[PDB]
From a paper:
Synpcc7942_2462 from the cyanobacteria Synechococcus elongatus PCC 7942 encodes a putative sugar kinase (SePSK), and this kinase contains 426 amino acids. The At2g21370 gene product from Arabidopsis thaliana, xylulose kinase-1 (AtXK-1), whose mature form contains 436 amino acids, is located in the chloroplast (ChloroP 1.1 Server). SePSK and AtXK-1 display a sequence identity of 44.9%, and belong to the ribulokinase-like carbohydrate kinases, a sub-family of FGGY family carbohydrate kinases. Domain I exhibits a ribonuclease H-like folding pattern, and is responsible for the substrate binding, while domain II possesses an actin-like ATPase domain that binds cofactor ATP.
Apo-AtXK-1 exhibits a folding pattern similar to that of SePSK in line with their high sequence identity. However, superposition of structures of AtXK-1 and SePSK shows some differences, especially at the loop regions. A considerable difference is found in the loop3 linking β3 and α4, which is stretched out in the AtXK-1 structure, while in the SePSK structure, it is bent back towards the inner part. The corresponding residues between these two structures (SePSK-Lys35 and AtXK-1-Lys48) have a distance of 15.4 Å. In contrary, limited increasing of ATP hydrolysis activity was detected for AtXK-1 upon addition of D-ribulose, despite its structural similarity with SePSK. Structural comparison of SePSK and AtXK-1 showed that while the RBL1 binding pocket is conserved, the RBL2 pocket is disrupted in AtXK-1 structure, despite the fact that the residues interacting with RBL2 are highly conserved between the two proteins. In the RBL-SePSK structure, a 2.6 Å hydrogen bond is present between RBL2 and Ser12, while in the AtXK-1 structure this hydrogen bond with the corresponding residue (Ser22) is broken. This break is probably induced by the conformational change of the two β-sheets (β1 and β2), with the result that the linking loop (loop 1) is located further away from the RBL2 binding site.
Author numbering: 11 to 434
Write the structure that this text describes.
Amino acid sequence: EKLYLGMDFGTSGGRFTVIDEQGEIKAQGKREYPPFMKEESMGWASSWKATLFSLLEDIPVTVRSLVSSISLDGTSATTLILNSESGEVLCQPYLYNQSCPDALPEVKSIAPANHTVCSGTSTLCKLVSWWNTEVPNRESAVLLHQADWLLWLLHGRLGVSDYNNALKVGYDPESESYPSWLLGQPYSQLLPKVQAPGTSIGNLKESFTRQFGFPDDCIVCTGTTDSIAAFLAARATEPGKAVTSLGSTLAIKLLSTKRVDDARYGVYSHRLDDKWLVGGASNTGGAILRQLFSDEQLERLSQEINPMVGSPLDYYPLQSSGERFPIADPNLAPRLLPRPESDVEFLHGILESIARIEGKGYKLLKELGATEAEEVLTAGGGAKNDKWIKIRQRVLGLPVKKAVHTEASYGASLLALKGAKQNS
């Protein structure tokens, strides 16, 4: 009878999924972020909060009465600064895709070369930028990631984050600590304490049980980032299990017993349980397809493909020059020649070549030290093309299928469940 709520705060709106213990969906829904008042110093944060309340309201009351645990994900490196005593958000959030170049040299002056913080969009660059604006009483401020802040709205215990959200500020999930080069700086006093994703923080606040009818013993758990929640939704849990996201671009994630980080290729690892999620991202993918054909042309041409026969066409499908993974060449040219007169042959060549690139990506992760890929689940638009699925299975020489669930909010609900089970 106990249910488990996960929310996903994405780039333009929030979503929620409520599951039972067996992962069956009892309720789900979405809301776009409302506008905020021009004068609101909170900016987008005020909207996010509104969305939180809206989503909670959207859950059927009979479903809310059964919800035993809550987790949620948010966007990576979306950074808020609060006064520790009042809880006041001291400025507009630093959004996931917002950069603080002004802080990057200082960060490079304390962090290891090619550490993942050494990027203008990193949480740490944002922290250092804010710090250096010398706000009065800044030493009484605290940093929260988007997810941490929304969760804190729910449980009332200030300053807790997770292994995943905290990565871009410099937290090391392997030693479960912030490194001395970070702790040696005064803004380190703003850093949140860090737990594993999907672990209990505290009971849901009485305000929410009173207003929405959640049971008194409902708990609130740490979250994760939306990318990782989305991966979790697939329920790939063993090393060698992989999820390929086939969308506008191509991105892969591979579960591994061994941590892998390599700046040459932009390869980075997050911690999950006792494992490492190793990610890599290519500029190839569906964008060039839809650039070349209509969606109607795409499915109609797809129906004419024999996926069990390989294309002789060697393409590197790109819209413009440049690749970082699985080839580190910022000048890498698109290759779409020769283009056969048959659009079916052309399409087959593109799909097959993207499969080649995907395979090469998994091989590179393996060569960098990851557990070798054994099976590939598929997310993104590309997943609904079964001809492409069969092509990929043949070219990769591995079993390939659709992931069953891919929504971040579904993965967040799995974290809520994990937290409840652990807490029990």
